[PDB]
Amino acid sequence: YDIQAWKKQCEELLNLIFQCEDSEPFRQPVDLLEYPDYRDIIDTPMDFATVRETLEAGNYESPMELCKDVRLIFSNSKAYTPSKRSRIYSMSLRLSAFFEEHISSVLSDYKSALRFHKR
């Protein structure tokens, strides 16, 4: 029932993600001058380095917030990708699956910890 355990769990999961080849397209922010169209499609840029930075700054209060930003990475790349005949989209789907399979217990454990605390 450790209310704070999620943070190290999320750090370790981001480490796994960064080690994963599938994360390559998503590790750093997009350059808007390099990707002309991104401006008009993505309303909120997000990448894994920003997520890790936010976590390490102490600017996430819950793993749910971290989860929302990670899911934004995946919806952003979906919005911009105009075809499945793309190494990027297939990479997003696989990395998303991996992320969700690992983040599920992190969320569960945090929410039970908060419930226990307010018991």
Ligand SMILES: COc1ccc(NC(=O)N2CCN(C(=O)c3sccc3F)C[C@H]2C)cc1
């Ligand atoms: C053949 O050479 C290529 C080299 C690279 C690329 N990459 C792309 O097309 N990407 C990168 C992933 N996309 C993203 O939305 C995000 S989300 C956080 C980071 C990020 F980059 C979509 C799009 C901008 C394409 C072709």
